[PDB]
Design a protein around this nucleic acid. Structure first.
Ligand SMILES: [K+]
Ligand SMILES: [Mg+2]
Ligand SMILES: [Mg+2]
Ligand SMILES: [Mg+2]
Ligand SMILES: [Mg+2]
Ligand SMILES: [Mg+2]
Ligand SMILES: [Mg+2]
Ligand SMILES: [Mg+2]
Ligand SMILES: [Mg+2]
Ligand SMILES: [Mg+2]
Ligand SMILES: [Mg+2]
Lengths: 337, 325, 208, 134, 132
RNA sequence: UUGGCGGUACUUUAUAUCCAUCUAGAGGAGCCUGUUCUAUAAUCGAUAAACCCCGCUCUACCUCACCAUCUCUUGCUAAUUCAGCCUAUAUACCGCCAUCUUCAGCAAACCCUAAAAAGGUAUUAAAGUAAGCAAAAGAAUCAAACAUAAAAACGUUAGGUCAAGGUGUAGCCAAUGAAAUGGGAAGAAAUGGGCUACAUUUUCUUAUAAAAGAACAUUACUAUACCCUUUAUGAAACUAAAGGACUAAGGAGGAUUUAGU
């Protein structure tokens, strides 16, 4: 009967069975059947002037007509091809880049942060993921509620970078919250000549030790995969780092920014001590290179040079220079970073 | 960042355009109804809209309206700073510039009265404005703690010596208390062709309705529906109910009543007459007596009426038996 | 209720309103002035200023009424008073001058003094402790004590009477027999008191 | 440091707790105020779980006297629990709660009325797989 | 819980229209009736026939204007005239509406033997009363 | 660090409710009706609270989905190797609901934290904020109130319903489909609900619930049963009503339970 026929929305609602007792506490896919239908087109192949064909053709007011059996079979086959092509389009997708692995979110770009209150675009900033946790708690809504905690980092590759944590029930929301929060906590990291840190940095943040080293050009980033991601956002091109103790991602991000943002530039050192800062490169011979001169008054008392320094040395650093064999894993051939 | 539409807020440019369309709307609505645009008013507009767009929706907020933008649009949506971004009021950054600007003025008045140095009941039968009324004057949302603090400050002002300026100020926040006098409204005293005085009043008990016609001078002859009262009311309790109004005022055998009761049963018809007689007898008694009648229940209509039966249960309150488990 | 809680019970005392203003206690005087700005409930159909209206007798009528048959219940009470007045007139006329003095012929005074004679001071409420039903002596309020006297009368007459006798003839014979402190209702009162004396020691087991 | 620092069996526990708390309230050991209240104890009822301990004290006629007695008794109930653990009456004692018992007033009432009575004559969603594809 | 004609709450992202937002108990209070005939008035006949004709007229207009209806249609019967008032989205070209109006009117006048007119108000997009 | 339940039995709390108080009932007899059981060749579903005069505001045929027997094979439609299908899964669902419930919560987007597994209050105020959903308000019961209706989010019970209808998956197409005829029975049985009576505040008669005249224990009260007639509906009386007699039991109903402010 014509009176027992229901609309498409109600037919798919029942068939999909998305809202149900099984679905909530524990595959059918929806389709649109009006996608390719052109108003005025039927199986019989009639041609309706003003609906599915031109109302006037070559100055002639058209009249009703019907397509031949051969012509209609072509049109039916053509639509079948277009439907089959549409299915192929659904399968096709533009592959985006993986991160540190193929099934992990760490290292994956998610674009720039959203515009600001007064149209402050951040197209020059890139966002990278560092950790994605799917944690479940115990709330009455589901008995065991769902939560997604996302740590992200942002940077323009020109010295400005920041990190934030975003939490939500949906992963997409946790990305937006973290991504837009980090733009409000931008550290500025001082780079020596735009490619490396000004000096060696050793620090302990909670139980995570980081040990960074200043390196010459062309050395590349030989660091923990998370440090490489952040260093690219900061703009550091050449550095070495070692991480020991706990590998907590948050302590490494907090510890990294803590150490990189508390480093002393050469210009600062000249002012603190009042002396010239001179540089000696082995590829330039004995030529002294003046990299920073005190802003105010140059002193005349030479800095005390002890016969034997009391510096606290790391066994790991010294061990190499003592002739001790390194591990089989050290200084392996790796892709360019 | 959600699909829910962004907060819809109105600028001064927007409301200004909404007031030009309303002004042009009136000139058209006036031309439709054949009235003069100059004199056309808010009252005529509302009447015209009701004729041209008849709606029988019970809730009147859902009916068609052509009102002035000030009424419909929330008033607390006006620009609070200029082009250069400098707010207009020095207390803008408090978030309650109007509440605190008022608390600033009242605290300054209090200080001058206390520094500079009779009965305080200049106004009687008045109340402090309720929070809803205050929020309207300030045009900003207030909390319950904010209202309590404002009243305590206004009270302190009254305690102190108050010049005529202060009395006018506190008057702004004093609203006349409703004077609903529960005093019976005496009926007129008409005159018959014979010239005798008589008053009439209606009464309703359950589904019964009565229309009594008490006469100032009589021997106690009560006629119900053109019949005597001993005949019409063979039950003793029904006659006693007719005796209650007169017996109370010691006026038995002094009035002649003619009643017409239609509807209800025997008891409901006697009660309907009792109220109708008590209300008509008011015109022939002193005001002190009328209050004595009101305080004995003789002048209050009885609101008790049969309640509807409910679906799924035997009666109005009776429930179907809870089947033995 | 269809009356909001602000409504006041009506006062239908004729003399109270007509008393001189000075004769009224200031507490009563205050209530009158307060009531002028308040709402009063309409008087009930059975509430009148009649001088013959007795609240106790009106209450006894309602406790005999069945299914809203007030005419029949009032008729039974009216016939009862008449049956008691006619029974005392017979005895009064058939008695010597000395006996005539004591005989009481007012039915309203025989009814009130009869009921009062059937009111129990103490009561027994049935409780369960330790898997058995232990009742305990209780002190009865003025309302519970009055209700029990009326209920016991309306129950002796309704049940323990011959099939052909009528309630105006059984109730009259019980009000008069109770009025002399010899009826069965009085015995019911004695039993209730007697049971309490037996259980006086075990009053401890009350929690209310 | 300091700021951070600061059937048959129930019959035996109910009776003994009553036997001991009566002694604590017969002297100023708890407090002089508690001594002056001259409080009497109807009974002690310990719950089955032992979460709390009910102490029924014979209420009086005056509401003001009872309201004051309640406040003073409750404030000292925590200290009273300490005294029973310290004297080694019971190793573990539940939080003592003080409950009223107005039966004593009723008990006197019955005798008065009874005497006057007339007896009468005798995974895929979580993973980036969907995202990476596009 | 009552499930009848209620668009249930989502998480603030479902755009319901004025008609959809209001549950049945607001009928005659906040929202009116989509069909207005004299067949349900007291002592009037042919309620069954008017109700059946409406059901068909609603299914016919949906199919004839598929995906072009912004809201439910409003049916107005005066004398023997039937009037169909529909809010239609501006998806189709203008001339296509002139065809569907001429077709749907003529077809429905020869099916129910009454004068039928179609009144179309075009909206730029569905009007959202609230987001639920 | 949280969530839970354990014996949360403790203090306040319920409000026609847990006990108490009050009124009329149920529990006994007779019937009416649903269910279970027995049972029949002979539906199905509901079946603790939240089933049991339930889907049915309604089964003599029809209704009908059941059973026996006989018959039809492109078998409702414009077309279709198609029509049709009350065939299985309500544990695939839509739809419409029960329930806690007139319970009070559900809370998106922002902001803050010496890192956050989470938390975010102080009013003589100390980091929270500006918006929704429910409640409230509003409207209905045709003045006014009150009351009653209606309203009551998210979850709980894979709660109920493939047999209102639609529908996913699987199954039948000379049969699990279509049609015709005749049947779909009963109780030394249990139980739920309703109805009537058991009487004197009653029975009958006239009025009318006023009053009066009679009856008033062996059939006086008391049969909506069985049986006997007439009548209404219908093609069909197997139905209903009205009389007629026949009249049996019942004498106010154990523990226990229902409703009412
Ligand atoms: K369902
Ligand atoms: Mg892989
Ligand atoms: Mg009833
Ligand atoms: Mg089932
Ligand atoms: Mg049949
Ligand atoms: Mg058949
Ligand atoms: Mg079949
Ligand atoms: Mg209202
Ligand atoms: Mg509401
Ligand atoms: Mg078959
Ligand atoms: Mg016939």
């Amino acid at each position: 009967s014509f009176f027992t026929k229901l609309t498409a929305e109600e037919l798919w609602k029942g068939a999909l069975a998305e809202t149900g007792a099984g679905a909530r506490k524990g595959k059918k896919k929806r389709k649109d059947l009006n996608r390719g239908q052109i108003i005025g087109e039927g199986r019989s192949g009639f041609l309706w002037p003003g609906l599915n064909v031109p109302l006037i053709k070559s100055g002639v007011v058209q009249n009703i007509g019907q397509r031949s059996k051969e012509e209609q079979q072509k049109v039916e086959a053509t639509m079948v091809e277009q439907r089959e092509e549409w299915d192929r389009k659904r399968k096709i997708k533009v592959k985006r880049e993986r991160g540190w692995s193929g099934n992990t979110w760490g290292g994956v770009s998610i674009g720039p942060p959203d515009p600001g209150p007064n149209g402050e675009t951040y197209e020059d900033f890139d966002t990278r993921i560092l950790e994605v946790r799917n944690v479940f708690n115990m709330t009455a809504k589901e008995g065991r509620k769902k939560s997604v905690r996302v740590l992200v980092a942002v940077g323009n590759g020109n010295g400005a970078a920041g990190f934030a944590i975003g939490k939500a029930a949906d992963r997409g929301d946790a990305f937006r919250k973290a991504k837009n929060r980090a733009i409000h906590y931008l550290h500025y990291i001082e780079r020596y000549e735009g490619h490396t840190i000004f000096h060696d940095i050793s620090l302990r943040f909670k139980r995570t030790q980081i040990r960074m080293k200043k390196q010459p050009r062309g050395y590349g980033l030989r660091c923990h995969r998370a440090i490489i991601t952040i260093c690219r956002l900061i703009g550091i091109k050449d550095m070495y780092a070692r991480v020991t103790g706990s590998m907590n991602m948050l302590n490494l991000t907090r510890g990294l920014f803590h150490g990189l943002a508390r480093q002393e530039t050469h210009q600062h050192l000249a002012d603190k001590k009042g002396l010239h800062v001179v540089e000696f490169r082995e590829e330039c011979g004995p030529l002294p290179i003046v990299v920073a001169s005190p802003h105010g008054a140059l002193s005349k008392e030479p800095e005390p040079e002890p016969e034997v320094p009391d510096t606290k040395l790391d066994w790991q650093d010294v061990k190499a220079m003592q002739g001790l064999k390194r591990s089989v894993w050290f200084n392996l051939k790796r892709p360019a970073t | 960042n959600v699909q829910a539409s962004r907060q819809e807020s109105y600028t001064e440019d927007f409301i200004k355009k909404q007031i030009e369309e309303f002004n042009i709307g009136k000139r058209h609505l006036a031309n439709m109804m054949g009235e003069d645009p100059e004199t056309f008013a808010e009252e005529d507009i509302d009447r015209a809209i009701a004729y041209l767009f008849p709606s029988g929706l019970f809730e009147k907020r859902a009916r068609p309206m052509m009102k002035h933008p000030e009424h419909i649009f929330p008033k607390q949506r006006a620009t609070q700073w200029g082009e250069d971004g400098r707010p207009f009021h020095f207390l803008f950054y408090t978030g309650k510039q109007s509440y605190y600007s008022l608390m600033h003025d009242v605290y300054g008045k209090v200080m001058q009265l206390e520094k500079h140095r009779a009965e305080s009941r200049d106004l009687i039968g008045s109340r402090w404005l309720i929070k809803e009324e205050l929020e309207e004057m300030l045009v900003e949302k207030l909390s319950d703690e904010d209202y309590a603090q404002f009243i305590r400050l206004l009270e302190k002002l009254l305690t102190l010596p108050c010049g005529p300026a202060e009395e006018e100020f506190v008057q702004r926040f004093r609203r006349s208390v409703t004077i609903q006098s529960k005093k019976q409204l005496i009926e007129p005293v008409q005159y018959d062709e014979q010239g005798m005085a008589f008053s009439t009043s209606e009464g309703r008990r359950k589904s019964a309705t009565a229309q009594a016609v008490v006469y100032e001078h009589g021997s106690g002859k009560i006629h119900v529906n053109g019949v005597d009262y001993l005949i019409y009311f063979p039950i003793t309790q029904d006659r006693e109910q007719l005796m209650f109004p007169f017996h109370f005022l010691d006026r038995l055998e002094r009035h002649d009543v003619t009643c017409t009761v239609s509807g209800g049963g025997r008891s409901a018809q006697a009660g309907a007459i009792r109220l109708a007689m008590a209300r008509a007898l008011c015109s022939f008694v002193t005001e002190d007596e009328v209050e004595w009648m009101r305080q004995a229940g003789l002048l209050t209509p009885d609101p008790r009426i049969r309640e509807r039966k409910k679906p799924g249960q035997e009666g109005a309150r009776r429930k179907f038996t809870w089947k033995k488990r | 209720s269809r009356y909001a809680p602000e409504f006041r019970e009506p006062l239908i005392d004729k003399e109270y309103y007509r008393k001189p203003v000075a004769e009224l206690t200031e507490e009563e005087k205050y209530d009158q002035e307060l009531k002028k700005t308040q709402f009063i409930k309409a008087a009930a159909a059975t509430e009148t200023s009649s001088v013959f209206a007795d609240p106790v007798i009106s209450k006894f009528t309602n406790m005999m009424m069945k299914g809203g048959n007030k005419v029949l219940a009032r008729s039974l009470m009216a016939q009862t008073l008449e049956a008691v007045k006619r029974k005392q007139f017979e005895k009064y006329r058939a008695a010597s001058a000395e006996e005539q003095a004591t005989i009481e012929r007012n039915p309203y005074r025989i009814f009130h003094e009869a009921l009062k004679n059937c009111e129990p001071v103490i009561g027994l409420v049935p409780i369960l402790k330790g898997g058995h039903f232990y009742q305990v002596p209780v002190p009865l309020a003025d309302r519970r004590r009055r209700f029990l006297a009326m209920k016991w009368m309306i129950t002796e007459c309704r049940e323990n009477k011959p099939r052909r006798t009528l309630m105006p003839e059984k109730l009259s014979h019980e009000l008069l027999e109770a009025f002399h402190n010899r009826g069965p209702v009085i015995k019911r009162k004695h039993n209730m008191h007697k049971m309490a004396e037996a259980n006086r020691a075990l009053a401890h087991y009350r929690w209310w | 440091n300091l700021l951070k620092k600061f059937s048959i069996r129930l019959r035996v526990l109910n009776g003994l707790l009553y036997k001991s708390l009566t002694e604590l309230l017969c002297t100023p050991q708890v407090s002089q105020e508690v001594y002056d209240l001259n409080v009497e104890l109807s009974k002690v009822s310990v719950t089955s779980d032992f979460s709390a301990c009910r102490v029924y004290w014979k209420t009086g006629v005056s509401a003001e006297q009872n309201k004051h007695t309640e406040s003073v008794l409750q404030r000292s109930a925590a200290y009273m629990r300490h005294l029973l653990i310290s004297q080694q009456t019971l190793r573990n004692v539940p939080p003592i709660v003080f409950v009223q018992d107005k039966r004593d007033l009723v008990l006197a009432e019955v005798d008065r009325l009874l005497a006057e009575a007339d007896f009468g004559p005798p995974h895929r969603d979580a993973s980036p797989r969907s995202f990476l594809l596009g | 819980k009552n499930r009848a004609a209620r668009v249930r709450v989502a998480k603030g992202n479902k755009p319901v229209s004025y008609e959809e937002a209001h549950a049945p108990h607001y009928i005659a209070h906040r929202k009116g009736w989509l069909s207005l005939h004299t067949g349900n008035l007291d002592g009037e006949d042919h309620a069954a026939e008017r109700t059946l004709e409406d059901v068909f007229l609603r299914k016919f207009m949906m199919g004839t204007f598929p995906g072009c209806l912004a809201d439910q249609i409003v049916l107005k019967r005066r004398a023997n005239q039937v009037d169909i008032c529909a809010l239609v989205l501006r998806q189709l070209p203008a001339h296509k509406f002139y065809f569907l109006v001429g077709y749907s009117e003529t077809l429905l006048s020869h099916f129910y033997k009454c004068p039928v007119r179609l009144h179309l108000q075009t909206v730029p997009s569905k009007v959202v009363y609230k987001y639920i």
